[PDB]
Structure formats: C-alpha cells, structure tokens
Design an enzyme around this catalytic site. Structure first.
Site: not given
Lengths: 283, 283, 283, 283
Positions: A71, A134, A190, A204
């Site tokens: 991330e 995210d 991911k 989600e």
C-alpha cells in the site's frame, strides 16, 4: 531506532513496519525494481536482523506488514503522479474501520443517513458491519494548489519516515468533505489473490455499491454518476476475475438499473509504471 | 482398505475421509462424546497411522476432512431425528457448487429464472457466482413414509461406509422438486469461526436471500414465507454474532420490506443433543 | 345580504353559497332531514328567488354549490362529533389546490422532499400535478382542549355565517404541523358518483399513496402505519365500487409490499347518523 | 338504410354513426377540409334529417359519435399513410374494454402475467381496472406485403361502409401476436380537451406505463426500449399540457429509472396533413 523489536513473547520479535520500509527502501531504486522484489527483498532484510539478534518473526506479522508495504508503495507513487500531473482527483489512503469510517469523508448530511440506517437496523436487531476500502479517489476541485504545496516533498527519492506518516494521515484533510459526486471510486489492493481475498473484495465492492444506492435514494438523485470499485494485485490471472467480477448483490433484486459488478476492473500493479497506467485509466 | 494412502507427493499421504470416520466412529459412543472430542480424537487416530507407516499428512487435508466429519456427524443425527420424529421436513446435505447447483432443487420453471439471470448478466459482462449452503431443510409433504422406509438403517449405532454414501447422495431424490415454499431454510456449518469463515457465511446468507427475492419477483409472490439462513459451529461467542447478523445486502437498498439479517440465527452444535435442540427449534 | 346576486351576464345570477346555506339551513332540522333533501330543498329555495327577481342560475353554479353544501353538512357534523367525543383526531376541510397544497400540513422538512421532487422533475421536463382531498383526518395529540374551547360554538343548531367561515379556515391551524404519522387519512366526497367522479377519486387516491410512499422512502421509515383514502356519497352502489377499489398504481410495479387499493373504503353519507358511523369507524 | 333511426324513446332518434359518416364523407374532399369542419358539418347534416322527420337527437349520441368520427378520420388516413409508405409499423384502432383487452395483443405468455396479477389482487380484495387506448402502434416486421394487399382498397376517395368495418376490425389480425418490443406506443385522441378528458388520458397513460413496467419485471428485461403514450386533439393549448405531461405515477416511488411522463407528447390533429406529420414523427 531498529527495524525489529522483541514482542516479549519469548523469542518473538515484532517488525517496525515503517522504519524497516524506509531503511530498506533508501537502498534501492524503486523506479527499476518491481514491487514484488521490494517485498521479498524486504522480507529477507528483516530475516537477517532476526538471525543476528537471535529471534523469531511469525509470518502473521510479515503478512500484516506485506500489505502495509504494498500500500505504501502504491500510495507514494499516487502522490508523485498527483504532484507531476494536472488532475482534479487525489488517491487517498484509508485507515482501518477499527478506528475510522470511510462514510465520514462525505458531508455530514450524507453520512447521517448511514448513521440513521445503522440505528434503525439495530432496533430491528440487525447490524450494519462495513469495511473501508484501501484507497478513495477524491475530487479536489479547487484545492489543487494547496495540496501541491503541502505535499511538495513526497517522493521515493527523498524517502523518510515522515513521508510514511503523511501518506497515512492525508485522509484527515477530507473529513466531512465530500458531496455524493466527490468520491469517484475506491481501490482495494492485495499482494496476491487467494480464495479468501477474492471473497473480501467481492463482498466489500457489493456493500459499497449498496450503500451508494442507499444514499442516491435518500437524496433522490436521478441518474447519478455512480461509484466504481477497483482491485489490484502484483499478479492477476483469469481465475481471479471469475469471482471478482460477480454481480453487486443489490442488482439481483432490481431490474430497473443496469447490472453492476461488485468489482468494475482489476489491475496488475507490480511497478511504478503500473501505478501510472492504472491511475491514468481510472482518472 | 486403509485409513490413509500415499499421495505420491513424497512422504505425503492423503486421508481416506470416509473409512477413517467409520473405523474410528465404530469405537466410540457418539451419544456421550461431544463432537469436538470426536474430531480431535479422529485427528490423533490418523496421526498414529502416519507415524507407523512413516508419512506426512498436511493440515490442509486435515482441514478439508474436519469439515467432512463435522457435517457427517450433524447429517447422520439429523436423519435419526427424522426417523424418530413426525416432521414434514428433512435436513439434506448438499454437494459442492463445483459439481452441483442448489438451485436445481427447485422445480425447473423456478431454476430457469436463475439460469435466465446468469445468461443476461454474462451478456452485460457480469458473472453470477453462487455457492451451496451445507444443508437444505426440505418440505417432504407426502413422502414421509417412503423416505422412512428408505432410510431405516441409518444410525451412528450401525455406522458403516454405506451410511456415509447415503448421507452424501440423499440430495439426488430432490432434484427438480421444490416449489418456492418447499425449501424452508439453509444451514451452513463450521468447526469453528474465524474471520474468513464469518465472512463466507455472511456473504452466502446475503446471496441466498437476494436470489430468493429475485424468484419472489419473477413469480410475483405476494407476502411469501421467506427463507431463513442459519449457521452453527462447535463453539460460538458474542464476537462471532457481530459479523454474522449483519444486514442482508439487498435490504440496504429497499425500505419496502422489513430488514433481513444475512444469518437469522447461530447455533452451538457440539453434540447430538445440540443437533436435536437446533432442529426442534428450526422445524 | 341576499341569497343570489346578478353576475352581470345578462339575466345571469350567481348564488351566494354561504348565505343561502345558512338562511335555508336555519329553517330545517338537520338531525331529521337526510342530506339529499336539504340539497334539493336548497336548490328549490334558490329557484324561487331567481323567479321572483326574474333571473337565471346555470346548473354549473348549482353543481359548484352542491359540493360546497354537501361538504359543509359533513364538515359541521364532524366538528360536533369532535366536540361531543374524546378522540385525538379531527376532520379538517381542505381548500382547493389553486390556493393551497395539502402537503404543507406536514412539517417543512417533509414537504420540502415533495418540493425537491417537483423541482427535479421540472428539470427533466415532467410536471407533478397534485390535488387536495376534501378532508384530512389529523392527529391532534395534545391540543384537544385548546380546539374544544376554540370550536365550542359550532353546531347546526346555532348555525351562522361565521360557522361556515370557521369550518372553511380551520386548516390554517395545521400548517407546517404534521409528522408522517399525524395525518391518518384523507376523505373525498361527492353528492353522487358518475364515471368522471369515480375516475377523479381513484386517481387522487393513487397519487396520495404514491406521495406517501415517496416520503416513507426519503425518511427511510420501516413498516410505517400508512395512510388510508376514503370516499363517500349520498348514495353508493356496487357499480361504484368496481372502479374505486382498483389498485393504487404504484403497487403494480412492486411485489415487496401488500397491494393497496386507491380507495380503501367507500361510505354512504346521507345523514348526520351516517357521518357518526363513518367517523367512529375511521377513527 | 337511413342516417338516423327512432330509438323508440318517443321523439328520440339514434344516429347510425357509420352510414352518416360515409354518406356525408362521400360529399366532401377530406384532403382540403379540416377535421373540425367535417365534424360540425356532420352534426348539421344529421340535424336536417331529424328536422325533416320531426325528431330529437340528444347531444349524448352526438358526443358518442363525434369520437367515432374523429377516430375514423385519423384511422383511415393512418392506413393510407401505411399504404403509401415503407414503414414497419401500422396504426391499429382498438375496441372498448367492455369487449376487448388491449393486453391480449401481446403473446399469451406475456398477457398471462397480467391475468395472474388481476387474479392475485382479487384475492387480496383489490381490482385491476384497465382501459384501452384508442390506437396501438404495432411492429409488423415481416407481414408488410400481406397487409398492403389486404388493405389495398382503403381510402377516403373510395370511402364505403366496408372501409369503416375494416378500420374497426383490423385489430383481430394482431391477437396473441406481440412480443414486448412489438407494441411501440399507444395514441389516445379527443375532439377537444376538457378537464375530465385531460384526467382520463393522464390516468390511462400512467396505467399503461405501470403495466409495461410490471411486464419488464416479470420477464427481467434489462434496459428495454419502453413504451410511449401520445395524445391528440383538433386543437391543443398550453393549459392542456400542464395536466397531460404530469409524471407517470410509478416514477414517484422509484429513483432507479429516469422519470417518465404519463403523456410523452401531445399532437394537434385537425387535418390529413397533421396525421402525416404526427405519424412521421412517432414512427
């Protein structure tokens, strides 16, 4: 400050995610190294240490950290792309639902509808458990200059611990900020997809589209732009697409609107050039 | 026939689930042994063998098998409960979606609506990935006697390999069978709940309620009974309930009907007496 | 003040509705005279005058007036019923849409949703033409005593011109007043039903139920009480019921809620005793 | 055969609509005479007769007949337009709901959904009263040649009683015929609009769009073409448009689709040239 520190659980050591990322990252050229090499390279770096000090680092901390690193790699490049471009959208990293609700990015009049829903459901003995994607792609109409001056020093080249903190707290500038049209999309990443991860993203994605539809109903917004939900990993394969591009659950019950996918598009992001391609395509 | 057999992957052995379950099960009194003891007891039994023969059994096969065993424990007792009772509902075990679609339990006129939906979505580039709950509670109005005669020999007491095969193939008697009201509920089980498992059940529960709502719409069934979706594990705790009793996703988009939970009720099933309690309450 | 006055259209005279109603009404016993006799009796009274003065009164003014009279007959008795009873609901007469919008009876936060809808539709080149039912049954939780003291002098016995004015302006006390649950129902009346009148009521009934459903959606009110829409005339027959009890138009498009009728119940009101029966049944 | 015949109600005579239309129509040039002149001209023609024979014709028969004539004027020209053009759509005149249900134009699998709805509603004590628009614009993909040969002799020039019968029975060729996409639109006409007539059209328009939406739901037709509902009169004014272009009632309850008007477009049709303009624009 060291990269690892004993978690007091015997031989157990915990990884200092940020320091380790910065210490290791300072030594490589992110522009020529694919993300997967930085991650494994980062895993080894940490192993050497644990061995010198005689310790043990469980793969759970590693797995927790792999996400952080992946991330931050994406998050920093997104900001550089912003600094280097003339777009009205900025990719902002979101904290966990444990301590933050992505719905609060919306103006309070909008988020209150969601709070109102949670409260009415609880009275009927039903919960509303949501998760935060995210990243959120936010429309910064007007404050481009302000943010550019604020984020001027952010880059892989001048990587520092403070850089990580900024990437991680930039979201604070966008609380009680967005109108329904201001959040353009969400992006969840991911390192690699496994059955459990494909499931998380599909669920989600569906949930975000359901809530968005709930807000469009409360405000009676006819023909709105809609939101997109994207997914990315260092490697994607056809088998991943099967489960991710399944219908958003609410579309199964309504013939009135075009069917929506839980995940609109999946991207392969194993480098800085992949970040730019994805971003140029999503903005 | 042995309980384990080399998977040719070197020291690798694969567990013969059914034989092992029957061989071990013959030696204990299921009525006095809680399910969790039978499972661990069953894990050890298999370990002894692997050690005698000098081999290795990965926890993946164990994990695959733990589910099989937990389900057979529940599935057999459900049939005994049926044999011993005067109910119109029978708890039938469902095979994996890899080889079976639980929607085919419905009459063909109903399942075709689902096939029609899958086809129209594929043309809009959207998939419809569904999963099969572990058990289906089916209304057997009329064929009680037939099934009782057919299933007369099923019990833990006279446990045999053929018993397992029946429990596993009983579903074949109910293909192209049910009207919308005939399937009363679904029940999915897990030895224990972990984050990934709570997610699976919540998502599946939501999906079943969405499809059911889709069928109620196609047939224009006003005020139907509705379907329930239950969950069970050898041990349940308040933390599990938070995520399982979240709203069925389609309810977030429609104020017209009462809000539904993805999972209507969670049951603790660590014994034969727990199966009966759950069943008496669900039927 | 005379009962009729020349409309300057030659021999044309216009009826002074209120004076004529009061002058004639003072002479009869409303409690023993069925409404239809008062209306025809009132038509004759006015004819005598027109003949003495040598004039002409078109049936359009008569038809306009017949409604006024029928409504005042019902409206006054409703208030007497209120004065004589211990109910929390009061039957209030509504003015025409030309000068008033029944939606303004609702709190401003609710009526604004309707104004918001009208505005968004106009931008899509669609109009929202609504009509006001004749009476609204309003929940006066709390202000029973205040209204009883205010309306103490209202009755057929002490009939006066000021009585008519009150019945006609009582609605002013309930502007920006009601929460969604405060308006219990609407009641529209006709001296007699003809094809055109059955159509009006069916359409209006449908429209009120559509708007109510729109408000339940904006506020996300789960399982609300709902509103009823009633119809009444001096004489009703089975043929009238066919067209009035047709489905509320929005129910044809949604299987999620029980089907609603445009008109929930039709009442025969040709006397004071009929008003009481209807009111005791509607409250 | 005479144009009028005593209805035995004393001096009462009934108009023989068809004969009178043909007898009078043979004498004028429809291509140079606006429709309103033919209608009044037709009213006078009939009056002369009633006077010669010493009789009385109530305006109710006249009003019943004015519609017949206005529709035949439009209906015949529509067929000439068809004969003279290369379009795939034909404008067909519909009989009254008393003896026909416009829903039967649809294939039986589609109309059965409507019959299913009527039956379920009746069980909940609700009626479904529908009306038939005056004309239906039907897609005749394939049978253009057949119909052209069949309808070759139809024209104002060679006007005959058999011409009227054909215009009135052509619909029989399209029973159990249309797929959801085959009926393109409906067109209801009035000599002139009055409050009661604007109401009828608005209500019918809404109802047709509700039923169409009901069918799109049963068949799960995503993004269908939709149906239009048009209105026409010999003279239209801005005041007429206010009430006719009001929202289709079901759109008030659903934010998911673009808002639809009860009446999509209103046309002025006082001549043959007006028919062509309207038709060229609607097809």
């Amino acid at each position: 400050m060291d990269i690892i520190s004993k978690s007091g659980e015997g031989n157990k050591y915990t990884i200092n995610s940020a320091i380790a990322f910065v210490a290791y990252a300072s030594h490589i050229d992110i522009n020529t190294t694919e993300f997967s090499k930085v991650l494994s390279g980062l895993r080894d770096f940490i192993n050497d240490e644990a061995i010198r000090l005689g310790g043990k680092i469980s793969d759970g901390s590693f797995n927790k950290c792999n996400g952080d690193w992946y991330e931050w790699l994406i998050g920093i490049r997104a900001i550089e792309f912003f600094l280097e471009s003339e777009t009205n959208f900025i990719v902002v990293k979101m904290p966990n639902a444990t301590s933050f609700d992505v719905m609060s990015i919306y103006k309070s009049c909008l988020s209150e509808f969601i709070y109102d829903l949670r409260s009415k459901l609880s009275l009927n003995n039903v919960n509303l458990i949501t998760s935060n994607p995210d990243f959120s792609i936010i429309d910064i109409r007007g404050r481009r200059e302000e943010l550019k001056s604020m984020l001027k020093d952010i880059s892989f080249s001048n990587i520092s611990l403070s850089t990580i903190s900024e990437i991680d707290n930039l979201y604070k500038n966008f609380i009680d900020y967005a109108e329904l049209e201001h959040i353009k999309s969400f992006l969840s990443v991911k390192t690699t997809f496994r059955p459990d991860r494909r499931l998380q993203l599909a669920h989600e994605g569906s949930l975000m589209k359901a809530l968005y539809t709930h807000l469009q109903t409360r405000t009676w917004t006819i023909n709105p732009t809609g939101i997109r939900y994207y997914a990315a990993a260092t490697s994607i394969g056809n088998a991943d697409v099967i489960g991710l591009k399944t219908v958003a659950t609410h579309s199964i019950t309504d013939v009135k609107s075009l069917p929506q996918s839980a995940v609109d598009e999946i991207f392969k992001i194993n480098s800085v050039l992949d970040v730019d391609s994805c971003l140029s395509h999503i903005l």
